[PDB]
């Protein structure tokens, strides 16, 4: 997959 910009939005 793709990693999100931030783990804890």
């Amino acid at each position, epitope marked *: *997959p*793709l*990693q*999100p*910009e*931030q*783990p*804890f*939005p």
Partner: antibody
Amino acid sequence: EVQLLESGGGLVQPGGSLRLSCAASGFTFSTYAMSWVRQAPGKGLEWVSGISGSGGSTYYADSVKGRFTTSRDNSKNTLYLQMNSLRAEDTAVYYCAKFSGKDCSGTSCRDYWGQGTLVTVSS
Amino acid sequence: QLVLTQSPSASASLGASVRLTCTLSSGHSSYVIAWHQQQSEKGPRYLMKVNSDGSHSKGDGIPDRFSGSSSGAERYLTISSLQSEDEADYYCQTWGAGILVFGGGTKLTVLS
């Protein structure tokens, strides 16, 4: 610059409760998510929890889910970890930490650690 | 599952250079990682970030001797001109959906 200072570590009986605090300074606290990381003696770093900048969303590792709670106060610039139903294997140094992610893009992409505080769960 | 693989130990000679390797599990080959240094009886110290184009975001006071690079699923920390103080545990760390993930850490021994 940024500073993170933990407090509240100590000795607790098995099944007991303990609350950790992390006083933050040097940045606008509410714009960053805040994390807890722990390290059992002689072992590696283990992620515990994360909480969004707004405090609207909390995240937990399976090893602590349902027993540990994390919160924050965005006026006192303080991050919290509330532990209940503590077990012997929760014995660790607990670090407060701030991981930035992908934005940022220079010095705002840095991460920061606290000094840690020791939690002992023992009879 | 998102996993970071580090060898437990590494060694090189005083004044020489060493390369530490963090490998992402398959399917996360574009992810950003961070390198953290932890000397004995001390808390971690952030060093830098490494994405697929190498790049950085070095922490304050991190020496030029420290650098990062990337190749495929592998992320590197290279320390040149090794000193005794470079003996430490080095952790790579990344993140996914609602998680952080740490490597097991590599213990660096500075020989000679």
